[PDB]
Design a protein around this motif. Structure first.
Motif, PDB file in Angstrom:
ATOM      1  N   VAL A 130       0.840  -1.205   0.000  1.00 37.26           N
ATOM      2  CA  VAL A 130       0.000   0.000   0.000  1.00 37.26           C
ATOM      3  C   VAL A 130       0.867   1.244   0.000  1.00 37.26           C
ATOM      4  O   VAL A 130       0.536   2.256  -0.631  1.00 37.26           O
ATOM      5  CB  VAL A 130      -0.981   0.011   1.195  1.00 37.26           C
ATOM      6  CG1 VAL A 130      -1.756  -1.285   1.271  1.00 37.26           C
ATOM      7  CG2 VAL A 130      -0.267   0.275   2.501  1.00 37.26           C
ATOM      8  N   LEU A 131       2.013   1.169   0.667  1.00 35.02           N
ATOM      9  CA  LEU A 131       2.896   2.303   0.856  1.00 35.02           C
ATOM     10  C   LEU A 131       4.183   2.199   0.041  1.00 35.02           C
ATOM     11  O   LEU A 131       4.624   3.207  -0.539  1.00 35.02           O
ATOM     12  CB  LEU A 131       3.225   2.421   2.343  1.00 35.02           C
ATOM     13  CG  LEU A 131       4.329   3.393   2.708  1.00 35.02           C
ATOM     14  CD1 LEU A 131       3.729   4.770   2.787  1.00 35.02           C
ATOM     15  CD2 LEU A 131       4.941   2.981   4.016  1.00 35.02           C
ATOM     16  N   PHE A 132       4.778   0.993  -0.038  1.00 40.13           N
ATOM     17  CA  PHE A 132       6.097   0.846  -0.655  1.00 40.13           C
ATOM     18  C   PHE A 132       6.016   0.938  -2.169  1.00 40.13           C
ATOM     19  O   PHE A 132       6.864   1.587  -2.792  1.00 40.13           O
ATOM     20  CB  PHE A 132       6.763  -0.477  -0.247  1.00 40.13           C
ATOM     21  CG  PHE A 132       7.235  -0.526   1.189  1.00 40.13           C
ATOM     22  CD1 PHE A 132       7.291   0.614   1.959  1.00 40.13           C
ATOM     23  CD2 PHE A 132       7.575  -1.726   1.773  1.00 40.13           C
ATOM     24  CE1 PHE A 132       7.706   0.557   3.264  1.00 40.13           C
ATOM     25  CE2 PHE A 132       7.973  -1.787   3.076  1.00 40.13           C
ATOM     26  CZ  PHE A 132       8.041  -0.645   3.823  1.00 40.13           C
ATOM     27  N   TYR A 133       5.017   0.296  -2.781  1.00 40.45           N
ATOM     28  CA  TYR A 133       4.964   0.284  -4.241  1.00 40.45           C
ATOM     29  C   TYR A 133       4.889   1.691  -4.834  1.00 40.45           C
ATOM     30  O   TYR A 133       5.664   1.972  -5.767  1.00 40.45           O
ATOM     31  CB  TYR A 133       3.799  -0.580  -4.733  1.00 40.45           C
ATOM     32  CG  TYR A 133       3.701  -0.666  -6.248  1.00 40.45           C
ATOM     33  CD1 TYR A 133       4.825  -0.987  -7.019  1.00 40.45           C
ATOM     34  CD2 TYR A 133       2.501  -0.419  -6.915  1.00 40.45           C
ATOM     35  CE1 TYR A 133       4.759  -1.071  -8.421  1.00 40.45           C
ATOM     36  CE2 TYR A 133       2.425  -0.493  -8.320  1.00 40.45           C
ATOM     37  CZ  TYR A 133       3.556  -0.825  -9.065  1.00 40.45           C
ATOM     38  OH  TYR A 133       3.482  -0.913 -10.441  1.00 40.45           O
ATOM     39  N   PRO A 134       4.034   2.614  -4.354  1.00 36.61           N
ATOM     40  CA  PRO A 134       4.123   4.005  -4.844  1.00 36.61           C
ATOM     41  C   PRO A 134       5.501   4.634  -4.655  1.00 36.61           C
ATOM     42  O   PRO A 134       6.009   5.299  -5.566  1.00 36.61           O
ATOM     43  CB  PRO A 134       3.065   4.728  -4.004  1.00 36.61           C
ATOM     44  CG  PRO A 134       2.093   3.686  -3.642  1.00 36.61           C
ATOM     45  CD  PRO A 134       2.881   2.436  -3.449  1.00 36.61           C
ATOM     46  N   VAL A 135       6.115   4.444  -3.487  1.00 37.23           N
ATOM     47  CA  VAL A 135       7.459   4.959  -3.261  1.00 37.23           C
ATOM     48  C   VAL A 135       8.423   4.428  -4.315  1.00 37.23           C
ATOM     49  O   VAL A 135       9.099   5.205  -5.007  1.00 37.23           O
ATOM     50  CB  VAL A 135       7.931   4.598  -1.844  1.00 37.23           C
ATOM     51  CG1 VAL A 135       9.421   4.893  -1.696  1.00 37.23           C
ATOM     52  CG2 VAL A 135       7.111   5.332  -0.818  1.00 37.23           C
ATOM     53  N   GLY A 136       8.524   3.092  -4.433  1.00 33.06           N
ATOM     54  CA  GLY A 136       9.387   2.495  -5.442  1.00 33.06           C
ATOM     55  C   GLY A 136       9.057   2.971  -6.840  1.00 33.06           C
ATOM     56  O   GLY A 136       9.942   3.395  -7.584  1.00 33.06           O
ATOM     57  N   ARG A 137       7.765   2.959  -7.192  1.00 30.26           N
ATOM     58  CA  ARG A 137       7.320   3.368  -8.527  1.00 30.26           C
ATOM     59  C   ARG A 137       7.618   4.843  -8.801  1.00 30.26           C
ATOM     60  O   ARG A 137       7.997   5.213  -9.919  1.00 30.26           O
ATOM     61  CB  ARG A 137       5.825   3.079  -8.681  1.00 30.26           C
ATOM     62  CG  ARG A 137       5.310   3.189 -10.098  1.00 30.26           C
ATOM     63  CD  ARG A 137       3.945   2.531 -10.265  1.00 30.26           C
ATOM     64  NE  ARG A 137       3.486   2.635 -11.647  1.00 30.26           N
ATOM     65  CZ  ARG A 137       2.668   3.574 -12.104  1.00 30.26           C
ATOM     66  NH1 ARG A 137       2.221   4.529 -11.287  1.00 30.26           N
ATOM     67  NH2 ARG A 137       2.316   3.573 -13.385  1.00 30.26           N
ATOM     68  N   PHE A 138       7.426   5.700  -7.798  1.00 27.15           N
ATOM     69  CA  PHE A 138       7.896   7.078  -7.873  1.00 27.15           C
ATOM     70  C   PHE A 138       9.396   7.156  -8.116  1.00 27.15           C
ATOM     71  O   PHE A 138       9.853   7.832  -9.047  1.00 27.15           O
ATOM     72  CB  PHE A 138       7.515   7.810  -6.589  1.00 27.15           C
ATOM     73  CG  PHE A 138       7.952   9.242  -6.551  1.00 27.15           C
ATOM     74  CD1 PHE A 138       7.322  10.202  -7.318  1.00 27.15           C
ATOM     75  CD2 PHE A 138       8.945   9.638  -5.664  1.00 27.15           C
ATOM     76  CE1 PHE A 138       7.727  11.516  -7.253  1.00 27.15           C
ATOM     77  CE2 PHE A 138       9.342  10.956  -5.583  1.00 27.15           C
ATOM     78  CZ  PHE A 138       8.736  11.892  -6.377  1.00 27.15           C
ATOM     79  N   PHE A 139      10.183   6.511  -7.250  1.00 26.41           N
ATOM     80  CA  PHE A 139      11.630   6.537  -7.417  1.00 26.41           C
ATOM     81  C   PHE A 139      12.007   6.256  -8.861  1.00 26.41           C
ATOM     82  O   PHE A 139      12.780   7.000  -9.477  1.00 26.41           O
ATOM     83  CB  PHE A 139      12.291   5.519  -6.492  1.00 26.41           C
ATOM     84  CG  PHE A 139      12.434   5.980  -5.081  1.00 26.41           C
ATOM     85  CD1 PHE A 139      11.976   7.228  -4.694  1.00 26.41           C
ATOM     86  CD2 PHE A 139      13.066   5.177  -4.142  1.00 26.41           C
ATOM     87  CE1 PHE A 139      12.123   7.656  -3.393  1.00 26.41           C
ATOM     88  CE2 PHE A 139      13.214   5.596  -2.842  1.00 26.41           C
ATOM     89  CZ  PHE A 139      12.750   6.836  -2.465  1.00 26.41           C
ATOM     90  N   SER A 140      11.409   5.210  -9.434  1.00 25.44           N
ATOM     91  CA  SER A 140      11.791   4.750 -10.760  1.00 25.44           C
ATOM     92  C   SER A 140      11.399   5.740 -11.847  1.00 25.44           C
ATOM     93  O   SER A 140      12.143   5.927 -12.816  1.00 25.44           O
ATOM     94  CB  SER A 140      11.148   3.409 -11.029  1.00 25.44           C
ATOM     95  OG  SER A 140      11.270   3.109 -12.399  1.00 25.44           O
ATOM     96  N   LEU A 141      10.222   6.357 -11.728  1.00 21.19           N
ATOM     97  CA  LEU A 141       9.774   7.293 -12.755  1.00 21.19           C
ATOM     98  C   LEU A 141      10.627   8.556 -12.747  1.00 21.19           C
ATOM     99  O   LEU A 141      10.891   9.142 -13.805  1.00 21.19           O
ATOM    100  CB  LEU A 141       8.295   7.607 -12.546  1.00 21.19           C
ATOM    101  CG  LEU A 141       7.409   6.440 -12.987  1.00 21.19           C
ATOM    102  CD1 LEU A 141       5.997   6.548 -12.441  1.00 21.19           C
ATOM    103  CD2 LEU A 141       7.389   6.392 -14.503  1.00 21.19           C
TER     104      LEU A 141
END
Ligand SMILES: CCCCCCCC/C=C\CCCCCCCC(=O)OC[C@H](O)CO
Ligand SMILES: CCCCCCCC/C=C\CCCCCCCC(=O)OC[C@H](O)CO
Ligand SMILES: CCCCCCCC/C=C\CCCCCCCC(=O)OC[C@H](O)CO
Ligand SMILES: CCCCCCCC/C=C\CCCCCCCC(=O)OC[C@H](O)CO
Ligand SMILES: [Mg+2]
Ligand SMILES: [Mg+2]
Ligand SMILES: [Zn+2]
Ligand SMILES: [Zn+2]
Lengths: 156, 156
Positions: A130-141
């Motif tokens: 719920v929290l990590f995937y947006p963080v990771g996905r943000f980092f990558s974009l």
């Protein structure tokens, strides 16, 4: 050297093992056997198959987080006890502990039990997602943003 | 906060990027295109294709080592400046820095330049392998030893 603070450290190295094991169990099952467990029910395997990046991403984030966390803990004990040599001590002690207990043992363990681990980890990881995937996905974009501005990746 | 000690920290995060990038560049080339670059010469690609575990192992070891190392450094600055809140600070600051600069950016970067990176990294990693590969290979043989005694892996 408080007692809780060793327990916290162990919890953390367990969590690193949990993450490195689940990473292995998910990717050795993928794709054919994951799909086969997915069309059968129920039910984590369907969630794993359908959004797998969501899972491997959380793991990457959860594995680095508790790895770094645990190292940063131990360094504080190493340096409170030994001064500037504690950095030396903690790097050694931890490099052993993440490698053996948070990586090489769990990954070794997972290939022999991929279905049970995957089934047991998919909801906990889905929660941490719920929290990590947006963080990771943000980092990558941003990462790939930073890259293309810099001409190290095909323009767009 | 000495000047060298920031440079050391940057060298380390560069090394983590070097390792996570080389890991990606080697495995996306493997096996077919690695073999194709290997039968052509010369010459790192032949070394990569022939003993690939030797390479991915060193990397695992070299990536955790400098990751932990760099975190342990930063924690010593975080705790000398901020007391027990430095562990908090360093975990946050580092979790950002390994993820973005030592992982998500290099891995993103590598898929777009696998042949050049692989060619450039194979000798340096082959060098670091003189020492790391036995360490990693030892860890694993004890790891799987510890597992089978414990009945978590098929007896032998
Ligand atoms: C599925 C595996 C979940 C964690 C198993 C613990 C393995 C290693 C944890 C040891 C912690 C460090 C002591
Ligand atoms: C599975 C193992 C779980 C952890 C096992 C025990 C933790 C010892 C770790 C680092 C010592 C580094 C020096 C720390 C200084 C202590 C004072
Ligand atoms: C092939 C890539 C080799 C390292 C490139 C540096 C990328 C990131 C390094 C940034 C270090 C942290 C500042
Ligand atoms: C590519 C980036 C390379 C590194 C960029 C600069 C390093 C700052 C890192 C951690 C600060 C954590 C708090 C440290 C306390 C300092 C006093
Ligand atoms: Mg781990
Ligand atoms: Mg790295
Ligand atoms: Zn079927
Ligand atoms: Zn050919």
């Amino acid at each position: 050297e408080n007692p809780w603070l060793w327990a916290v450290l162990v919890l953390l190295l367990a969590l690193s093992a949990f993450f490195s094991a689940s990473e292995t169990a998910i990717t050795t099952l993928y794709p054919w056997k994951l799909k086969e467990l997915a069309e059968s029910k129920n039910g984590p395997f369907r969630l794993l198959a359908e959004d797998i990046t969501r899972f491997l991403t959380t793991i990457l984030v959860g594995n680095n987080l508790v790895n770094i966390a645990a190292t940063a803990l131990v360094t504080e004990l190493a340096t409170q006890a030994f001064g500037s040599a504690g950095v030396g001590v903690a790097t050694g002690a931890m490099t052993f502990l993440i490698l053996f207990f948070g990586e090489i043992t769990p990954k070794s363990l997972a290939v022999h039990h991929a279905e049970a681990i995957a089934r047991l980890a998919a909801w906990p990881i889905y929660g941490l997602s719920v929290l990590f995937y947006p963080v990771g996905r943000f980092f990558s974009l941003v990462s790939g943003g930073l890259l293309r501005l810099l001409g190290l990746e095909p323009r767009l």
